[PDB]
Design a protein around this ligand. Sequence first.
Ligand SMILES: N[C@H]1C(C(=O)O)=CC=C[C@@H]1O
Ligand SMILES: N[C@H]1C(C(=O)O)=CC=C[C@@H]1O
Lengths: 278, 279
Amino acid sequence: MHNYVIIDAFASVPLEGNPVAVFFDADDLPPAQMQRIAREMNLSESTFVLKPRNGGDALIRIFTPVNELPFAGHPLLGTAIALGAHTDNHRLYLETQMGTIAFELERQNGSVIAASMDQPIPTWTALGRDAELLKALGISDSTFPIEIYHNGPRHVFVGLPSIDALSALHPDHRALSNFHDMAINCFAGAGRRWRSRMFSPAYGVVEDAATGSAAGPLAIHLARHGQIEFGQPVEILQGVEIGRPSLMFAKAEGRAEQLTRVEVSGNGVTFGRGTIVL
Amino acid sequence: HMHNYVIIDAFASVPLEGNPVAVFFDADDLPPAQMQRIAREMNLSESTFVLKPRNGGDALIRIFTPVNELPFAGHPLLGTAIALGAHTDNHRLYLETQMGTIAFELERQNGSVIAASMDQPIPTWTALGRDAELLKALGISDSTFPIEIYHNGPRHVFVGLPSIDALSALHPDHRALSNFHDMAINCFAGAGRRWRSRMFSPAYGVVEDAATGSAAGPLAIHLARHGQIEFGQPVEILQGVEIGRPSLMFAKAEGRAEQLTRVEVSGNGVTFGRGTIVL
Ligand SMILES: N[C@H]1C(C(=O)O)=CC=C[C@@H]1O
Ligand SMILES: N[C@H]1C(C(=O)O)=CC=C[C@@H]1O
């Protein structure tokens, strides 16, 4: 029987942010069973904590309702906050299929409030399917070039000219299903403060509340297209329209041709805790 | 303030099959606006909230999808009955809802509730009258029977498919279906005592539901009305296969079209997990 905790990632009060279910002592579970348990929980992702194989503190497998991912931001954030309660450490190294991800935990009197990660440095290229994507989304143009970024999963970015225009999107989900192994991230804002919405049939979600692996790439995207400075911290607020406001903090250091660090951080809180029968 | 919950997989005998529901105990201190938010947090087709009774039943149950409250629903109440069945020795349970009190008969094996049967509200029905629009949204050109909508709290439309292969081949346009408010679209195929279903409902916050217990009773009526079975004949409705959540519902509608005397729906259920929440 496995214990789990529900963490609300990128939130400072339960019922805000993006839930993840974090399953402990999962070494006895076959990957097909992990996928079934993820399907059962029906959250954007469930994670499984396994003994480390390469010098980290643990190995984390990450599942959507429909597939496994090699890296993801919100689920690893919540996993790191949940696992922080197990030890006194303020540095935590979590293994994933993209490599070992370093975390710094914000603790008060030993109690975990928040965490910060160094993400894999993404690569990118032009999407090459603009007219198809924009038709699906129900709009005419992107404010900036439409590019697709890879850090494990893939994330496409489409810019909107106002927050009201972002909120008014009603995408064709069936048409977005033609975009395999990627999530579609639509953004609007100014300066240090940005809003986002994410849609991904490929990753089993109509609309996601907090796409943490997209936050670091967005910071890169905004700097490459001259809207912010490299090294400038940004706030990205996602999930407002669906009633799940989630605050992600991101900073990309270096320059377009040579990035040195892609940091994403947030608060997280425990919503609940329990046990499953298998 | 803290609340205990159980996850019941309804219309299944083993975990990871059927349709999950989260059942929250001693929920009187939660305002409906907070219940709605908890249901979204769980993200299951429904969560239910167990309140003290007001009209001589055992409990009053409020039922929420991820986006709205419903006055009655089958799967969530089956799971609620099985969960509450662990706390009692009684053979029957009476659950108050916005639709009235729903009677359940509990089935035990060893010391343990493994299944239950409910008497549902008797539905009303009519044609939907929007065949062209609905069929377009579904991606097909007609239905094998008249397209009709039944009301037992929620509303359920039925669209018939000529084969199970044709049913599994549906790839509906969720956005176009969102123009159908306050209803679920139930697509069916099969023969005799054996039927397959798929349900789609942007109105009730689900792309595709695994087991729509409030649709099982009405489908039995619809099949009888349209001469595919006899009134009083029990049927087996298998839902959720294409999404990896196979769920078996048993239904019987007794009487005649002009006067239904009982609409019974039953099924197995099993506990998948339990826990506590911080509000
Ligand atoms: N939570 C999202 C995610 C993330 O990085 O948080 C990656 C891919 C899809 C999930 O819905
Ligand atoms: N499980 C379904 C339900 C039911 O009766 O089980 C009614 C309406 C929509 C839900 O997804």
